[PDB]
Amino acid sequence: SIERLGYLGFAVKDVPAWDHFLTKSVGLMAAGSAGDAALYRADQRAWRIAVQPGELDDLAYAGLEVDDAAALERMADKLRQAGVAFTRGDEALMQQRKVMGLLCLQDPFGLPLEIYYGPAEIFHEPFLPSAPVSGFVTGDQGIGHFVRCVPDTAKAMAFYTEVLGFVLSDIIDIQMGPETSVPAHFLHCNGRHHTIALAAFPIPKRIHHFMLQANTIDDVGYAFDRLDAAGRITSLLGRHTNDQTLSFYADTPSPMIEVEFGWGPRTVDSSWTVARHSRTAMWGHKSVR
Amino acid sequence: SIERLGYLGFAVKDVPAWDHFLTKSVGLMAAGSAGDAALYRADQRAWRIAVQPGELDDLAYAGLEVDDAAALERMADKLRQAGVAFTRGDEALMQQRKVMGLLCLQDPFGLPLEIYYGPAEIFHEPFLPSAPVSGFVTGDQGIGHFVRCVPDTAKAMAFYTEVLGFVLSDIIDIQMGPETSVPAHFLHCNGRHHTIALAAFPIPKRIHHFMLQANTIDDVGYAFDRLDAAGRITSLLGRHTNDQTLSFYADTPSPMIEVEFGWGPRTVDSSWTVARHSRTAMWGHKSVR
Amino acid sequence: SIERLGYLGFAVKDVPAWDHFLTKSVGLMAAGSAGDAALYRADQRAWRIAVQPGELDDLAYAGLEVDDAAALERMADKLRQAGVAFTRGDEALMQQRKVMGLLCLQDPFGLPLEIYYGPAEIFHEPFLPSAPVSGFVTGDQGIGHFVRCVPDTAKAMAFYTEVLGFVLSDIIDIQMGPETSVPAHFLHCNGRHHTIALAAFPIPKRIHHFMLQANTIDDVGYAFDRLDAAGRITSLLGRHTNDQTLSFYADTPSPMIEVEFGWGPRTVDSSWTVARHSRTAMWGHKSVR
Amino acid sequence: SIERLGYLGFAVKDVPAWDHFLTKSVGLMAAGSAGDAALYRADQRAWRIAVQPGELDDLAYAGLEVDDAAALERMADKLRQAGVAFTRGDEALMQQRKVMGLLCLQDPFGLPLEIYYGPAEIFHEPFLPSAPVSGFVTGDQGIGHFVRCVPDTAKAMAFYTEVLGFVLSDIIDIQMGPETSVPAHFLHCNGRHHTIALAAFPIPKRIHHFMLQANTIDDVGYAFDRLDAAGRITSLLGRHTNDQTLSFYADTPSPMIEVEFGWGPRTVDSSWTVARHSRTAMWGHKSVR
Amino acid sequence: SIERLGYLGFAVKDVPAWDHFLTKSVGLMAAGSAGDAALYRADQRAWRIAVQPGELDDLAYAGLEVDDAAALERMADKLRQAGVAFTRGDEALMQQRKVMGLLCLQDPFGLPLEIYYGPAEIFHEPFLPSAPVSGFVTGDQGIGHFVRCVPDTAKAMAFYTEVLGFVLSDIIDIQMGPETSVPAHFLHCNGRHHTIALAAFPIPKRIHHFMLQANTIDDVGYAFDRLDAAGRITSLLGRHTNDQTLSFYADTPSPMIEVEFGWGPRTVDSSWTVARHSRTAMWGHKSVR
Amino acid sequence: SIERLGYLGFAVKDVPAWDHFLTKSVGLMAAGSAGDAALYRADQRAWRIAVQPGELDDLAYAGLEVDDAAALERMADKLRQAGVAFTRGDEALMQQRKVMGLLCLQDPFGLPLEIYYGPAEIFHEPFLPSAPVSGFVTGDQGIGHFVRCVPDTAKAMAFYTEVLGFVLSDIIDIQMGPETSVPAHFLHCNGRHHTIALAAFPIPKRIHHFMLQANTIDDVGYAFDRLDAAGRITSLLGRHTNDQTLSFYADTPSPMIEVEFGWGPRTVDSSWTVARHSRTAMWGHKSVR
Amino acid sequence: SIERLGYLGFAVKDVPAWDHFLTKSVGLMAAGSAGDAALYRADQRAWRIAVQPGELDDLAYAGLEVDDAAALERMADKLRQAGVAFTRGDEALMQQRKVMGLLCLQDPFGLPLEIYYGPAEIFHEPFLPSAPVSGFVTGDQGIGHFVRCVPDTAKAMAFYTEVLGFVLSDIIDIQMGPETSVPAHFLHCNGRHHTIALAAFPIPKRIHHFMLQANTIDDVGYAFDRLDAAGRITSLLGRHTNDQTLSFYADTPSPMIEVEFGWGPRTVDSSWTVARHSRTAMWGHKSVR
Numbered sequence A, B, C, D, E, F, G: 001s002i003e004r005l006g007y008l009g010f011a012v013k014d015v016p017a018w019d020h021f022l023t024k025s026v027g028l029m030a031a032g033s034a035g036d037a038a039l040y041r042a043d044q045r046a047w048r049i050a051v052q053p054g055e056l057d058d059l060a061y062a063g064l065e066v067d068d069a070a071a072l073e074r075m076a077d078k079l080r081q082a083g084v085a086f087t088r089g090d091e092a093l094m095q096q097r098k099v100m101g102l103l104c105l106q107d108p109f110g111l112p113l114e115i116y117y118g119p120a121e122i123f124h125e126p127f128l129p130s131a132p133v134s135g136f137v138t139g140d141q142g143i144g145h146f147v148r149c150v151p152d153t154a155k156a157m158a159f160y161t162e163v164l165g166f167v168l169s170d171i172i173d174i175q176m177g178p179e180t181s182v183p184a185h186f187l188h189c190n191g192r193h194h195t196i197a198l199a200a201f202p203i204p205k206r207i208h209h210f211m212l213q214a215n216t217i218d219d220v221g222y223a224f225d226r227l228d229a230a231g232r233i234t235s236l237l238g239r240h241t242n243d244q245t246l247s248f249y250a251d252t253p254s255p256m257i258e259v260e261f262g263w264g265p266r267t268v269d270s271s272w273t274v275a276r277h278s279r280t281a282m283w284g285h286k287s288v289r
């Protein structure tokens, strides 16, 4: 029922650092501010990523998008039935997020979520990258995806699939040590292979990384050099086994939070078949961190 | 449930003026008369626009099309259930409109509507424009669209969506003054971004303008010169934020009633997402009136 | 529910004449016999048209095809419920028609119909025309169409649509005299604009004509010369207003029964809209008979 | 060396008749006048066909187009070398024809020809047909073609090919009587199968007919009805053996001068092979005159 | 300079056998006769293959086609210069071959050749196969190809390439025995990989086989069954190493003369590179004879 | 022989103004400096436009590009033969222009030209617009075009065509007053309709305007708003008669020097035909200056 | 005049190492031997790369391919005229290289070259990679390219371009140190951006590296892992500035000789323009050696 991941908000110790990072390195377009949040664009939306000051140095909230007012009410009904606590956003928050309506809640482990509809668009102010990137693949598939760290994967799954409507794409057993592996669960809610992945990682953050998809392979290759020059590279170029995203990872200014910049993944449809993978990389992705 | 806007009828103080306007300027094909109404064609339909003498100088009625006899009966049932008053058209009116069946009613604010099915087509008399226009985009998306002025938008919405079946595409807050803006609601009932838009405008007419879509950009550019020569231009070429219709506006011979001539808008489908815009123009559309 | 018109059987006074006609003029492939019926092919089916001796000089029966055994049983249930009398074909008839199952019945006015499934195909004996025709458009749309003459159109309609599942495409008012016109009703049951049309014609036959669709326009042009040389032409080339079939008509050896040979008609889909036409010809089709 | 047939001028006894004919029947756009010549357009050229008063009731002259000033001078040199008499057009004639330069001459049998370059175009006045025709195929292939009647075909050939540069496409032996046939020679100077054809016909005119090519088959079918209603049809629809032009012929208001309206012919290229045909019609083209 | 192989003439001991073979097995269309030669068509040409009575039971002559009259004269000049004896065909022979002009000669080893231009075409009598074959690939690439047996390959090469203009495509060393192999030389004169191949085979005939190319793979598969039923198969289906023709061979009624029926070979262009192959078959082509 | 217009250099009274103009308004990418010239990029070239301080406020020089070293030498030979004075650029100038070789000269009326080869490209520094423009159409067609003002058009023509190799596309008679018109000559040297146009305009500058071609129509529409906001618009959107460039004009910071921003013009090829036009605008282009 | 690089032969100290390398790492297909040379295939050619024992540990010879026998003779004539010493290969060498003819020579600095024609192909033994690679891009563009180290670039250029016919694509100044850069010259002889590049590198080998082009990007990514596992990687993935080859470099078992494995480069045509680049990498290609 959730249609796609619409936006992301971070609370960070170094806002200027994040600002230079999202613009000069990632290529996002600086789009003013809202309250104490610096806004960044990747397309026609008024904003896609917000950065506000905070000791968390983590993802502060994620906006899950539905297609209309009725859709939002149906979601409220679903939350009620599932016994999930939520608060309807007030005029102030609606004004802040630039949405027509939203329900604020949390997943089983504390990550604030905001189900909303009616996002603001500013076509009269065409997107202009701050670095050389031909553009980002968003649209119906949203802004990108992120891997959510959870203490209990089965519990996170029930909520994301049963309450929010995400559908399992596949699983990848991620080798942690000699005989230690974590089964990462990749979920989709539209054509993007996965919008949210759940994994029991020994990480002190709400997420491992967030991913943005560029239009061309050169976008990625160019982006890799920009981040290598910034000395932020954590992995060499590679392609994933399940979604086939060709990408590289890099450190954001927030310790233990990374960004993935990729291109050309496979998409999901009705006939999608659940499968299991033993490795995350088809090829490449050698760790550099 | 209404499938598309099929026809439009105007009651005007200057019929010869409207006649020269629809033909020499807009390019429509004169198609004889019915009663005291001059008929005009834009394609294979026996008529699409009718012009009759009247002090109103406004839209007299709008024909909403359904795909068959059963569809019309289902609509009657819906009107009954909604408590909406209607009268089945008699042989005379059917003969006049050249339709197989129709229900006559009014929207909440007095605009006569006629739900019909089985329109007449005259393929043996191929459309021939009266001015240089390659053709119009009609077909499944109907004749075009119009913006309906209403005193109460919420009330108009309930009727058009709940009773007639239109679906909200998006909203554009139209700046009226210093701190005055009107939220225009754009509704679709097929692939055309919108067939009817509702807005609380301080206009003494039932509508602000009606829109026709030509096949090429040159059609529009050529049309702009024809209307500029007639001195009717009210806006320069531009493209809208929501549907991306590239067009210009011009005054019809009826004061405060305009026509929009455009090309290449985006179309709507199942996956359409409701959004909000702060401006009507992506670019251009500078007021000239 | 009927999926398409699968076959046609004629009972004629001059079988050799019909044989030379279907082969040398129309181009069908002679395919042996079954009982006292000469069989003719137009594609991979064991037969599409059968010709047997008889004083009728008219269509003897029409095979309406469904996609499987269950489909046929569902149709029997429907006939039962509608009070329509029918007999399940015996081994003998199944053997004769080369089908896996069939129900024999009659429409409201005596035309024998046979609802069947599991037709026989002989791919090991590729279709070979008897005259120069690149091929026929059949497949999912069946063998072609025919216009059924009826005394009561409303009564025929109820049966064909309500009992058999055909859907109205459109209507054409056919001028008969000074102030006499017959509203022909065109029905579809798949992508072919119409498989059966009903009209109250003052003709002493069950049908006016049957139609076959060739692959190219040259097929038709070539066919016209072949039939003109046989002196059978009844109409010049033309294109119809509703389906846009480009064709010509010719007399079969059975008096008052004609054949239509055409190309490139428009096809029907979910979004089809019922409409009315005042003429049968878009252009051409001048009577020659 | 001649690049294409650019224009045609007729001298006729009934100008109003020719005017109604070229516009209401053929669909050409009336384009004012030059001297005592009424001009008609088929596309972006200022004019393509001119009609002036005269007892001839025949083609008065044909404009053969080259691509530039040098090209015209090279042609003058060629005429000089071939001993062909010519006169360079004066300012007056250049003004009249709306060309940048032209050489006036005659073919071996008296038909005035004008080799020119730099034709005038009026894109600011888009072509608008006077009858329903989607458009004409001109461009690099010129306005169309015409069949030139000559007393000596071998003599006409030497001139058109050796002096003017036309290249033989093929020949069609046209049966005249019991044992009388005329070998028509079809010549091209660009992609159009033929721009000029030569034949020893017992006709008292400089040409048999001129041909115009419409964009669609419906254009032709529609045109046939328009001319049949005018009672001018001389041949039924058909397709030619050599160029495969699908067309019909009709009488112009000038006795023994016809017009051919067609669609979809084959085009010529480098690899074209000369061939011989025994008939003019692939199919159709039955004489009606 | 020769443009393509246009026709073939055989002199055979059993004409009725060859007639049933070319029609019922190969699928060619019987096209009457000329003198004592039975003619057969494969497309729009008046004839492509001729069969006349004779003790030879071999290829009697091959028609090499040029694009026009000048081309033929240029070829005569070339023959003169090369000292090759030739005779211009008289009206009688021109009438017999249905060509506009031809030069009769012989290759270095006695095979009569006829260089001609202006072949006759009969589009008013569309090709109609005598057996199920969708059509043949001819056109600019001619009727097909044949392998010419010669006592001296170097001598044959000089003539075919130096005098007639054929260009070497490649060579295939054909294993004859333990340590005996014949280098077959494949020559092209257009896009067809080869129109004539030369090889020093111990065969008492002028040729080994002639080849015809069908439009689809099913054409070939179907043809194989037809000839297997006739018990004429000499090789199983296979694909050649150099041209990639997928085909099978079969015996004609003339002992030691075979026919090849194939599909989908590669074509030749300007950039073609000469190469050498050790086998004739890429796969398949197992001998059955 | 000149292959395309590679670069442009301006000498202006207000460099900061030109800098803000080329970047914020036009969208070019600032690319450092060379000597006292500020460089700007539109694609992969190290620079395309240079701006240096000077009282001229006009085009200082134009770089005409050839494909290699030999090409440049052939051009020197041509200049020698034509008696045109030129100087080979020294290491310093080569270093300044970033080219491998260049010849410096002047056209008949003082505009410095530099024929060069081997331009520098910096793919490792991807083009990044300074304003929202999807990109520019350059490549084989160079950077764009410019209209050169000359006192004697015939004299300018001889030089540009006879010495430099440009080819005339067409002419447009530009109405100056009541009975005063200037015949503008448009020249091409590649697929771009024209790279240089010559016209006898009463302007005190070397050029009237220079033109840049964007990838999309939205690029232009967006650009128009940016320049209108800067209050520099001199013409409304429109499309030209000859090249069909859809564009608008605007004033550069240099008085009487304008810029044209357009999209979608037609391109030129071998078969191009010289023609004459009476107006510059197909539609639109209303003067605003 | 040389058409493409056909083959390469190496003389190496460790043949088994090279064998495992070309097969298990690169993916080439082992194809037996010739004399003391192990042969390897990448496509339909009998062999593309040969490896023989030798102390050189360098490229032993390069086969330059022409399209036919005449072409080879024309090349001999050219060598004679240029005073370049050469020896026609004997039966033995022809047998060894599997070519129909070849001329053996050396470039100005000792690298043996063999101009040949008529290479052997074995389609009956389809290419089968020894490692996972979808295939290689060869065909008309040959096997790949190599960078030739030379002491005098101007001298090497004159020979390769003036004697052998290669054409300069572009130049890249390769930074060697603080103020030391080597101008690498890239030459083409077909569509491949470059087949041979010349550069004054301080390397004790005849070449720096040879390049092979795979069909997909995954081929390269997969290949990179295979060679990284072998610990041979010398550069990370990257894309070149001039040809845009996306690739990585790796060490062959021969010290100071590398291999480049890439995909998707740009191709060259008639309109190619010579240009200069300051870096070899568009992005990536970070040194790892």
Ligand SMILES: [Fe+3]
Binding pocket: A145, A147, A210, A211, A260
């Ligand atoms: Fe990821």
Ligand SMILES: [Fe+3]
Binding pocket: B145, B147, B210, B211, B260
């Ligand atoms: Fe509108």
Ligand SMILES: [Fe+3]
Binding pocket: C145, C147, C210, C211, C260
């Ligand atoms: Fe019909």
Ligand SMILES: [Fe+3]
Binding pocket: D145, D147, D210, D211, D260
């Ligand atoms: Fe004609």
Ligand SMILES: [Fe+3]
Binding pocket: E145, E147, E210, E211, E260
């Ligand atoms: Fe063969």
Ligand SMILES: [Fe+3]
Binding pocket: F145, F147, F210, F211, F260
């Ligand atoms: Fe311009």
Ligand SMILES: [Fe+3]
Binding pocket: G145, G147, G210, G211, G260
């Ligand atoms: Fe390389």
